[PDB]
Design a protein around this ligand. Structure first.
Ligand SMILES: Nc1nc(Cl)cc(N(Cc2cccs2)C2CC2)n1
Ligand SMILES: [Cl-]
Length: 461
């Protein structure tokens, strides 16, 4: 069976949630379901990101980084897929996966997902990034009601999953130490407590898995086979050796038109064999504009949806003018954030002045969108790693680096304003009184930030 059609290559960049969705063209589009979520990332990775920027890598740092990252993350991906999970999105060295199931099957699926989690940790027992540095992962699990949001215009589409289970998995995974599997409170509440031995996490209702101790007669393979009854797209029969059913997709121009809207044009160029397959793995100077949209505690998905949509419509128009791309969209703890990048495949130009002007335009517009409580934007400029991360069958373009993290922390630690780093401030074709030098905050994962500035804008008022 020939499988290497463009439609199949596009499907590598998307979950089954999207590939096999069959939803309307209205934007926003929302749907509601239940599932179990897994959030996982890799320890010692930042350490490596640093190693690969240095001269010892002889101009092949981005190539070597992408290789070693994909070596590890593709193993995680394969575990997830063989356990029946759907990888939703990647961000750097992190990924979110979903096992969508009927409410009645949540108990047994939690068991599957815990076993998957333990098998993931098992890959990394004894593993080192390099001699002297271990590679381990941290896992959070959650379960419950999940909403999906699809937003976009006639040319581009984005999706998010939303709700308390989504917030829960992020919180769980944040409490995890290397080697941990943390369960959300609701996940512990819904699980097969007869089989899962936990310990309390101090000052938290979330719990830590110590062991899976199944009954004497339990057989995991048989249990798993029964669970597959409820997995609509588990590869089976003649396709039992495939990691994904999506590998069997056949040409279908209406489906392909829908799916391509989720994928960046430079990626589609590679997929169409009009660009070299290695061209997107690079350490390149970019400017990151990280936009955070905060909603109220009580806001439901049905009001968040339209507001994201409205914000998006303006974001995309401004980025187009200023030559920027949306690299990734995230949502947790009532903040929807857009990781925007100026300068990447082909787009290099007063990149700084424009990133700042774009940020102010976004800030001013979004601040007026109904339901958006606070807009915050962090702007940082520097060398970042760009590349397609994941497995051959399930991968995405992503950006990794200290300036990405810096922009992300700025937007959270300095809410309600537009902030920029020192590179941006100094490089800009703009006068000093357009800025305000800020108090320096101690920020998680942040270096010495260097001086940080608010972009005040062109007038006092
Ligand atoms: N809300 C949301 N949706 C998706 Cl599909 C992904 C995503 N993020 C951020 C989150 C991580 C954990 C819970 S939400 C993944 C890509 C890092 N956030
Ligand atoms: Cl870096």
């Amino acid at each position: 069976e020939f499988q290497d059609w463009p439609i199949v290559r596009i499907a590598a960049h998307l979950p089954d949630l999207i590939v096999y969705g069959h939803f309307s063209p209205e934007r926003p589009f929302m749907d509601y379901f239940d599932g179990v979520l897994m959030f996982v990332d890799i320890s010692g990775f930042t350490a490596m990101t640093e190693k690969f920027s240095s001269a010892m890598y002889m101009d092949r740092g981005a190539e070597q980084l992408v290789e070693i990252l994909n070596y590890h993350i593709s193993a995680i991906v394969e575990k997830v897929l063989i356990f029946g999970g759907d990888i939703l999105k990647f961000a750097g060295d992190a990924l979110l996966a979903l096992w969508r199931v009927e409410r009645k099957q949540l108990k047994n699926i939690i068991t599957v997902v815990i076993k998957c989690s333990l098998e993931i940790h098992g890959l990394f027992e004894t593993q080192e990034w390099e001699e002297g540095l271990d590679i381990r992962v941290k896992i959070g699990l959650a379960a419950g009601h999940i909403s999906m949001l699809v937003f976009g215009d006639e040319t581009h589409s984005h999706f998010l999953v939303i709700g308390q289970a989504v917030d829960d998995v992020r919180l769980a995974q944040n409490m995890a130490q290397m080697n941990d599997v943390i369960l959300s409170p609701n996940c512990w509440q819904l699980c097969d407590r007869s089989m899962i031995e936990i310990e309390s996490v101090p000052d938290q209702r979330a719990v830590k898995v110590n062991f899976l101790k199944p009954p004497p007669n339990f057989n995991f393979d048989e249990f798993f086979t029964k669970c597959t009854t409820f997995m609509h797209y588990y590869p089976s029969g003649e396709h039992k050796n495939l990691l994904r059913l999506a590998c069997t997709l056949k040409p279908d121009p209406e489906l392909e038109m829908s799916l391509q809207k989720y994928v960046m044009e430079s990626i589609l160029k590679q997929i169409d064999n009009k660009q070299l397959q290695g061209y997107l793995s690079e350490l390149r100077p970019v400017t990151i504009v990280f936009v955070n949209l905060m909603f109220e505690d009580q806001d439901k998905a049905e009001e968040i949806g339209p507001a994201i949509q409205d914000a998006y419509m303006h974001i995309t128009s401004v980025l187009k003018i200023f030559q920027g791309q949306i690299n990734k969209v995230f949502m947790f703890d009532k903040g929807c954030s857009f990781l925007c990048v100026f300068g990447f495949p082909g787009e290099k130009v007063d990149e700084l002045t424009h990133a700042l002007e774009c940020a102010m335009d976004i800030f001013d517009f979004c601040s007026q969108v109904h339901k958006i409580q606070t807009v915050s934007i962090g702007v940082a400029s520097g060398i970042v790693f760009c590349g397609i991360v994941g497995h051959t069958v399930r991968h995405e373009y992503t950006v990794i680096g200290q300036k990405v993290n810096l922009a992300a922390r700025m937007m959270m630690y300095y809410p309600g304003i537009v902030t920029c780093d020192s590179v941006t401030y100094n490089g800009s074709n703009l006068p000093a009184y357009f800025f305000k030098e800020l108090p320096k905050k101690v920020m998680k994962g942040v270096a010495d930030s260097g001086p940080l500035y608010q972009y005040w804008g062109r007038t006092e008022k």
